[PDB]
Design a protein around this ligand. Structure first.
Ligand SMILES: Nc1ncnc2c1ncn2[C@H]1C[C@H](O)[C@@H](COP(=O)(O)OP(=O)(O)OP(=O)(O)O)O1
Ligand SMILES: [Ca+2]
Ligand SMILES: [Ca+2]
Ligand SMILES: [Ca+2]
Length: 341
DNA sequence: CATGGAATCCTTCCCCC
DNA sequence: GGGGGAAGGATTCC
């Protein structure tokens, strides 16, 4: 079984670069301005000219300018990146019907057919990296291996602009050498709970009584880990589908004032509805980020679709329930529509 | 200082054979 | 006791 994982390099920055080659060579930072103040916002992503100096997704736009005051800073243009991504996803389809679009820049292909071994796999890897670099002019990294997890790990290793294969001989040394935290799906919270269990490697998951592990990180997660370690993880490449559509915005000022909030909320709803395009939700949730960056939410499922008129009205009772229930001031507000017909 | 989007799992009810 | 869902939160990663 051979899985090939494709991963567009510093994607947003690269796209901004492809749309204005004059940028190539310079440090480019794609930002998300929250407009609360001068350069308030976070970094969506940066190309390597910037990443090599610490500028990476998540850090404040202000902190980055301290590091590279002369780098190019650009506002995020989601739609544009999204279309470029789709086009690229097709070039990839033409390499296997078995494709799993994970994110806006990640995908897996089941090429157990086409290829007969890790060699022809590699070639197909160079062939693909090439077609994309030609058709759209964008570099991607290719991870190749037995299952999705290791194909992705190969990618993390071989990037940027690389391609790497992780054969069975190596998978086994990794299940031993590779640090557990460096395993897809293990954030810091998990990584932390894992230390406390003396589990710092995939292998240690076999020296613990499953039931204790299930009580620490959860059944799903514990089974996930245990099967990888046992060299038995074998998840299929399935095609995913949008299960929720939403929009969250930041308010110039933290508020509790219903009226002060509504405008931001209706705007979120409006945008959301435009995005739903043809899709009809039976579920709605109102989401809020408290002034201490905590998240609060209240929803409701209807026994039928939801009209914009109903959503408008219904989202207000939920924002009210929120303010009634919680007392902190609200920083960001938004809606999320799920359970399409 | 810290945008914003979305999927998945875990707990806690809760109604009911 | 446990099936079946809805809710609200926890956690991960793009
Ligand atoms: N906090 C964020 N806000 C908005 N967009 C984000 C955020 N974090 C990540 N993204 C986007 C950034 C990228 O354009 C896209 C993710 O690709 P990642 O960021 O996974 O790879 P990258 O392409 O920047 O790194 P690499 O050099 O491995 O290719 O997801
Ligand atoms: Ca990635
Ligand atoms: Ca990437
Ligand atoms: Ca990790």
């Amino acid at each position: 079984m051979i899985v090939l994982f494709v991963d567009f390099d510093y994607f947003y920055a690269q796209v901004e670069e492809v749309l204005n080659p004059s940028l190539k060579g310079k440090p480019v930072v794609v930002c998300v301005f929250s407009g609360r103040f001068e350069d308030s916002g976070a970094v969506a992503t940066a190309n390597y000219e910037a990443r090599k100096f610490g500028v990476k997704a998540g850090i404040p736009i202000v902190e980055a300018k301290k590091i590279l005051p002369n780098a190019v800073y650009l506002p995020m243009r989601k739609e544009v990146y999204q279309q470029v991504s789709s086009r690229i996803m097709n070039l990839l389809r033409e390499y296997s019907e078995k494709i799993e679009i994970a994110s806006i820049d990640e995908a897996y292909l089941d090429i157990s057919d086409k290829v007969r071994d890790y060699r022809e796999a590699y070639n197909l890897g160079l062939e693909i990296k090439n077609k994309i670099l030609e058709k759209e002019k964008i570099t991607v990294t290719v991870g190749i291996s037995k299952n999705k997890v290791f194909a992705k790990i190969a990618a993390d290793m071989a990037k940027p602009n690389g391609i790497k294969v992780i054969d069975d001989e190596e998978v086994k040394r990794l299940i031993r050498e590779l640090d557990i935290a460096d395993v897809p799906g293990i954030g810091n919270i998990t990584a932390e709970k894992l230390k406390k269990l003396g589990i710092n490697k995939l292998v240690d998951t076999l020296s613990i009584e499953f039931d204790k592990l299930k009580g620490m990180i959860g059944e799903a997660k514990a089974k996930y880990l245990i099967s990888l370690a046992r060299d038995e993880y074998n998840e299929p490449i399935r095609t995913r589908v949008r299960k929720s559509i939403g929009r969250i915005v930041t308010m110039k000022r933290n508020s509790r004032n219903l009226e002060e909030i509504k405008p931001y909320l209706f705007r979120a709803i409006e945008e959301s509805y435009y995005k739903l395009d043809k899709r009809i939700p039976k579920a709605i949730h109102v989401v809020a980020v408290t002034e201490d960056l905590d998240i609060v939410s209240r929803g409701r499922t209807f026994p039928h679709g939801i009209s914009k008129e109903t959503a408008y009205s219904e989202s207000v009772k939920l924002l009210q329930k929120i303010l009634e229930e919680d007392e902190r001031k609200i920083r960001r507000i938004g809606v999320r529509f799920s359970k399409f017909i």
